[PDB]
Write a protein that binds this ligand. Sequence first.
Ligand SMILES: O=CCc1ccccc1
Ligand SMILES: O=CCc1ccccc1
Ligand SMILES: [Cu+2]
Ligand SMILES: [Cu+2]
Ligand code: NA
Ligand code: NA
Ligand code: NA
Ligand code: NA
Lengths: 620, 620
Amino acid sequence: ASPFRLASAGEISEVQGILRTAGLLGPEKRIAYLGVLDPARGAGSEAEDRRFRVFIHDVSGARPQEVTVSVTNGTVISAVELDTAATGELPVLEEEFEVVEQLLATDERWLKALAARNLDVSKVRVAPLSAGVFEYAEERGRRILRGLAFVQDFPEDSAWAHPVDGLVAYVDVVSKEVTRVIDTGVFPVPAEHGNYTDPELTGPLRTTQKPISITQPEGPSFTVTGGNHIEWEKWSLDVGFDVREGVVLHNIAFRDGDRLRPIINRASIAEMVVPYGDPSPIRSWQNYFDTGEYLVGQYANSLELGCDCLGDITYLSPVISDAFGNPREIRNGICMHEEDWGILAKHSDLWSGINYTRRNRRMVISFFTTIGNYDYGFYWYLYLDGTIEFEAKATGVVFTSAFPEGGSDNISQLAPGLGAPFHQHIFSARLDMAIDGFTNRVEEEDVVRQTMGPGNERGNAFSRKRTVLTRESEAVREADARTGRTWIISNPESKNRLNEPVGYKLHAHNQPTLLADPGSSIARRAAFATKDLWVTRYADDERYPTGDFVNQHSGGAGLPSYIAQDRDIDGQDIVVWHTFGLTHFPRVEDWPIMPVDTVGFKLRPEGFFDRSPVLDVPAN
Amino acid sequence: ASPFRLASAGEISEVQGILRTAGLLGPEKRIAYLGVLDPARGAGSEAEDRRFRVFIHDVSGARPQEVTVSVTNGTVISAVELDTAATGELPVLEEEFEVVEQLLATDERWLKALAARNLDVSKVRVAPLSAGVFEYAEERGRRILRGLAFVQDFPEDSAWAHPVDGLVAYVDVVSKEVTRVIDTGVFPVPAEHGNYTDPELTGPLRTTQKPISITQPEGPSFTVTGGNHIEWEKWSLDVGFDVREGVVLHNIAFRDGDRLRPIINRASIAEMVVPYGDPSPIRSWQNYFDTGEYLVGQYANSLELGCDCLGDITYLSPVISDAFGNPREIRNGICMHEEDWGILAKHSDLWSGINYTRRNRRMVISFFTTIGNYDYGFYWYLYLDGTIEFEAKATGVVFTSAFPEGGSDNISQLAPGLGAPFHQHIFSARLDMAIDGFTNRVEEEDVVRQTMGPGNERGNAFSRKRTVLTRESEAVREADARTGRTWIISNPESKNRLNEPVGYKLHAHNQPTLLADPGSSIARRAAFATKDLWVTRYADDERYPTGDFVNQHSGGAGLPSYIAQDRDIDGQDIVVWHTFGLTHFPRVEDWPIMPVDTVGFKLRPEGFFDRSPVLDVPAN
Ligand SMILES: O=CCc1ccccc1
Ligand SMILES: O=CCc1ccccc1
Ligand SMILES: [Cu+2]
Ligand SMILES: [Cu+2]
Ligand code: NA
Ligand code: NA
Ligand code: NA
Ligand code: NA
């Protein structure tokens, strides 16, 4: 009955039938994106209308289309032809991954470059990399991928250990033309293998690890109803799944006595970008938006009990569309479980004689995605004390190059002749806030140092200041770790028992933002990544910080266009966009497969409750 | 046999006998500190000599003494009389906690102040707070404590809910004189109770939490030999305990193939300070050094299985001295266990078809201490991949005041009439480094942004720079989150297979350092806390960042005095001192007992290994 339920196989099959009957899904068509639309604001009309948004690619060169369909009524709501030179290309199709390698294998320039290196074409894998927008006028309005080559010595070899540097090609995947092959010189192909399951490399496996057994003999503390509605330790929320964003959290609320109090209306990772800092023309164009260009949800892993998720696990298996509109289940794509989280509160009092200890726990909602060499785990955490936390776990295989003789200021050496270019991993969290309702505002809070003098004669005082962000043009903010800068989202019309507005405080990790020159192509296309915090006024069509069509879009779409409207955000329906990321100088220990590194953010209640919300937790 | 073994009851009883026979432990004497000395550098002589350092207080006014004794030989090595006006007072004695309240209860000025407030003297608890050094010339060379009052309505009442503001007293605990009583005006005593075990405040306890069972059916993966030597998943270390510092880690090393490779010679939290930012004369002197003034190890809790430590726990029960030289066991004062820590590494490869997942785990060594209203957990973590992490968990009850009518820039309101002054919690980690041996150096690493132009035509390049710290005068460093600043400790004489110096990278949380005016008394006494990182040349007697006698010391001791020697630290035996802390603006949710908040730091290998060190972890 819930409008926030996961898409079903039957819904997707109906979408397929509707599109087919409307003449929109002929043999030349491919679905590049399909997802359910959220209910519009003011859905208190009980009018169930399940709508789906579809991007339809055409492999014959005809214009792609954006289509909205109602599965409830069986109708096409709207269908628009896209001019991709203007608004951007559609996301990369899984079936195009192989097309780049296949087209290059018959190109005489490519074969000549491989022949000079004595590389057998049958052993050469080509990574299908997004193109961006640079100096090549012939690419405007064409669907381009760029290819970088890696050697596989045998079918189970890790090709990443064998980059073919000095060589890059550009391909038009619709007309099936290789537009350019650039060969800047012969680099030795690094010869050491990177096969992390080869006993020669691992040595004998440890026999010293004894099992850790995590069980719940009475089952878990959370309940799941209607497929995707979670209730856990006063929390309530709906777990959604979208092929672009992955796991999406809806209607996060906390039951405080008799009242269900909303906190966040929608939480998602709405974009991520990996920019490379190597100035070599072989890679200086390389910036991939895993979310906006490739769609991280379609590459979600099936998670194995005992390996990926340990404990008493409840799974969800989301359904997505394939390129022809058939429903495809991602079996066990989402893990949900609770975890012990150490001490919650503790005090032994010298005067009352009372000794008190309580344990903490968290609810975990997670999925793992794989796009080429990189793998990421996305983790949402809910804690007993009202804290909400997100954490990204980055692992997989670092993207490699040759390591030049005489060194490099922009590449680290991992193995003889093997390099790893510097890069960043930058995420955008989109938090459609609803602190006790939709009337919200953001304050920036800084520590204030005070000078010794009158009223502060011993020079010990310090304070803080809060600055209300009142319009979008002043709501683009940067971090300041040295002044302890945080941001508070509050509801000025909802007060705690001390007559102060209820609020939540956002704690950032204060990692560096986008390092590229502000005049660069990537700074224009990933403008969101140049600042730590953006606040916009909610609007139905403002979904992604980069715009709807990221692939080969020339720049400026998304957040910089939204905030130009300079809307009132002081006590309004607002959305917080938080940029956070890792800056990766690869280390030898990252090779041949990288141990997890993490980054994230958290929100803690700030006068939201009238006292500690975990006084009613029992003593274990 | 190990020189790093925990002190035994028999050793402490021998110390007592030696001191007694030497005439040093008469009825007027109290042991204020007793601890075992670490072996001197170059202990490869196998000459076992267990030495103990003792601070001896005299309750009759005679000069205190510092004494070093050899329990192996049964001799006093040295005994020095202390001039406390010059070098500082001895740490606070547990038995002085009650003396402040008892002395005030017979002082006519104190009784007059309580009578005006209609407070029964039998219900008034007095916190025994360290005095610091301010404007009062009569305090120099006297042992002073300052008292702040709290009402207990009944024996099990939380007195912290009932601060008596506007009133402070100073007491000489040796001459037993109340030197000053300051009454700045009547504030209402806040009336709401803060009894977090009262059903009226908690409401009915949750019945929704189902058990989480963590067991190890084959026992834990670590071994303990010689009482305190740990081996776990290639890690080796000794767990020490000192009454001032608490848990101390010695000889941290990692078995890399056939070689035991040292990493850290000694790791400890060598000081912590809690400065208050309230300019009221009632509290503007308030700064307590829990480690240096009160000794956090003597207040370690006995940790309960299933409540404080969950899982298959191995306990240590350290032995300390009481004030008369009798050994006292802290039963179950240290928890040790391993914990699952999620995914270690994961990759599903599109070209090789290999799907690979490994799980992480960490070894946990922890203790919990309670000093008055505050409780802290100290956690050391060792991870499979070579990471070392420290985390402090702060909980307990916030220190309270009245909340003034008309508000405050330096106090937050927690309940009607009840305030909580702003403050910080700042720690100093002392890391006596031994990266592959004692020839170490520190580099500061900053991200380097590059301008678009020749050699960087697309404006994407970024780099990093490393600055070697060569002498102590240039080794006082501050954080810079915006440039991704970290510090690398390396061994220039020990190289990995790529011919690069092996190293470890220190990752700070980049929280604000000491906020007080640089001209203040606390900035002089806690100078370590004004900067994020200090590097000194190792010396036997340079143990604490604040000096040996912190209580009522006038300032400048410790790190600022050490670095004035301007010693060579480029490829030498060096010690890293890292300042890190929390800045606490108390929130309503911190009351009446505070949920845990955390802060810490970590060190990750940086080309220490020749590849990932966890390739030999099995597949679970
Ligand atoms: O993460 C997207 C870039 C990519 C895609 C496929 C193979 C290698 C790299
Ligand atoms: O943490 C040391 C300060 C303190 C000591 C005893 C009671 C309250 C506060
Ligand atoms: Cu990376
Ligand atoms: Cu605090
Ligand atoms: Na355009
Ligand atoms: Na909103
Ligand atoms: Na002095
Ligand atoms: Na050292």
